[PDB]
Amino acid sequence: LVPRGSHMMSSSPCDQLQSFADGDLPPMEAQAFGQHLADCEKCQVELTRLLQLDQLGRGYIERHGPVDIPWHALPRNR
């Protein structure tokens, strides 16, 4: 149940990674395009294009990258 507004267009998961690297993609869609984010030269070319201007910036680094998820999330839905 939603109003009518700007009609979106068709797009491919090789291009959707653009929103992923910019930091503007939701966690549900991040798994859905993730299957195509597998080993693909056309994907890596689109990703590295963004790193060429977003990774460019000495002083910004990381040294602790832990991977942990909350238990209350993923509710009993179908």
Residues within the interface to Zn ion (CB under 5 A) = 14, 36, 40, 42-43
CB of 43 to Zn ion, least distance (A): 4
Q: Identify which of residues 21 and 36 has a Cβ nearer to Zn ion in the complex.
A: 36
Q: Identify which of residues 36 and 50 has a Cβ nearer to Zn ion in the complex.
A: 36
Are the C-beta atoms of 21 and 54 separated by less than 8 Å?
yes
CB of 30 to Zn ion, least distance (A): 15
